[PDB]
Amino acid sequence: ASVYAWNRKRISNCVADYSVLYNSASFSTFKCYGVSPTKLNDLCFTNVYA
Amino acid sequence: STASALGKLQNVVNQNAQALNTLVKQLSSNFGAISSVLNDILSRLDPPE
């Protein structure tokens, strides 16, 4: 989507494996602010937004 | 029959209890950090922060 019409997706009721996202090198920039990326595999949230 | 004739001892007890209560409740403050519980900070962040 365009910047002024950015796409928003809502995620719930699933198991997420962020490890496969982090170990992949396909991304130029991967920056986590409130959490440590290596700790994401343990915390359980609700109401994820992408 | 008449009550409230022992205000001094009751006053002492109340003061002590109130001080202890506020000391305990101070443990829920934030002090400018992101959270007031050590476990959540420890289980969400890398040490350097």
UniProtKB/Swiss-Prot annotation, chain B:
Residue span of region Heptad repeat 1: 1-31
Annotated gene: S
Coiled-coil spans in chain: 10-49
Reported impact of S43A: In strain: Alpha/B.1.1.7
Protein's name according to its UniProt entry: Spike protein S2'
Task of the protein: Subunit of the fusion protein that is processed upon entry into the host cell. Mediates fusion of the virion and cellular membranes by functioning as a class I viral fusion protein. Contains a viral fusion peptide that is unmasked after S2 cleavage. This cleavage can occur at the cell membrane by host TMPRSS2 or during endocytosis by host CSTL. In either case, this triggers an extensive and irreversible conformational change that leads to fusion of the viral envelope with the cellular cytoplasmic membrane, releasing viral genomic RNA into the host cell cytoplasm.
Full-protein interval shown: 940 to 988 of 1273
Record annotation: effect of changing L42F: In strain: Omicron/BA.1
Superkingdom per UniProt: Viruses
Effect of N30K: In strain: Omicron/BA.1, Omicron/BA.2, Omicron/BA.2.12.1, Omicron/BA.2.75, Omicron/BA.4, Omicron/BA.5, Omicron/BQ.1.1, Omicron/XBB.1.5, Omicron/EG.5.1
Originating species: Severe acute respiratory syndrome coronavirus 2
